[PDB]
Each structure stands twice: as C-alpha cells, then as structure tokens.
Amino acid sequence: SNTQAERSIIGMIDMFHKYTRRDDKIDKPSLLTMMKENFPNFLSACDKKGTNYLADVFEKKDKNEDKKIDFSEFLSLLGDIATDYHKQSHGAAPCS
Amino acid sequence: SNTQAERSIIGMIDMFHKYTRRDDKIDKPSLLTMMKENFPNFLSACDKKGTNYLADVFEKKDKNEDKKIDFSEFLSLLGDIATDYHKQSHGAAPCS
C-alpha cells in the first residue's frame, strides 16, 4: 500500500541500518563498503572522470569530526549524490 | 544494471521533474499535489496524530522566500520525511 516514493524513503533508512554500529552511526570502513555495494555505477562514472570518490567522502561528510557518519551526515551524502544526478539530467557530465 | 539505491536516487530527480515549472522549481499548488500523490500514507499518519502537514510545508521549506521550491529545498523536504521515518524506526510515533 506504500507508494514507490514511500518505499524509497523506508529503504533508505533500512540501508543506513545495514551498516551502522551500535551507536546508530556508520564508521569509515562500513561507509566505503556501503558506497561500493549500493552506488557502484555512480563510483565507476567518477573513476572514468579521474575522481576517486572514496578517497575523501568520509572526511568531507563527517562534518562534526567525530569519526562516525550519523544519520544527518548520511542524508547530506545522499543529497550530494542526488545533486550530481540532477546536474547530469541538465546536461552536466557525471561526477561534476 | 543500476542498483536499488541508484534507481531510487534517479527516480527522486525524475519525481522532482514531474512537478517543476520552466524555471526548474516547484510552485506551491504543485508541491502539495506532489505530496498527496507520492506520500499519501505519510500524510495519513500525520492526520491521525492531528497534524496537517500540508498547511505549512511550503512556508517551512521555501527557505529563501522566493515562492518556489528549488532542488536544494526539495532535498531538505525529503530529508525531513526520511528523518521522521528514521525516528519511527527507533520507536517514535509517526510524524513526531
């Protein structure tokens, strides 16, 4: 009875919870695994452009420098991926 | 060949573009239609709790007060919906 958009939001929370530790936050090796497992085509587009997105993603998104990615910082990471796909839809190259 | 997570991000951009005007932004009646069409179960949970989420969503999310919701403000709206589902998964009531 949920719509495609509601299922996508619910699945986003469930995806976060595949990778969290017991403090409900994602550490660095688990964040890189999450990216490889869930955004491999995005990552491959970046590599084609000469960008290794995994070299700096944790440092860029761990905004409070606690060495963990909490749910708010995870939303910001999904917002960056979504913003790259929105620029592509307007004719930008991937991973711009 | 895209994963479920990549399909969800792509579908999010496509959903934004169902509702934009020619300036790539969503006006107020189209934002309310988008919510009714895409998040009806979320909305129904809010109504059960006595909250009419559509009364104030535009005013809360139009952060630069230009009377349009641009892609950045649309991501913030999806982040609020996702944060409510993340609190529910931790045992909060819906639409808290």
Ligand SMILES: O=S(=O)(O)c1ccc2cc(N=C3C=CCC=C3)ccc2c1
């Ligand atoms: O046709 S599919 O490629 O299988 C597809 C997948 C997910 C979608 C998410 C959509 N909406 C979202 C809402 C909130 C967060 C992410 C996507 C809309 C359409 C979608 C379509």
Ligand SMILES: O=S(=O)(O)c1ccc2cc(N=C3C=CCC=C3)ccc2c1
């Ligand atoms: O089994 S389903 O209910 O049909 C489903 C639907 C969408 C998902 C999105 C997922 N990941 C997302 C990534 C980015 C933005 C939104 C969701 C993960 C699992 C999902 C599962």
Ligand SMILES: [Ca+2]
């Ligand atoms: Ca952090």
Ligand SMILES: [Ca+2]
């Ligand atoms: Ca605005």
Ligand SMILES: [Zn+2]
């Ligand atoms: Zn959690």
Ligand SMILES: [Zn+2]
């Ligand atoms: Zn656009």
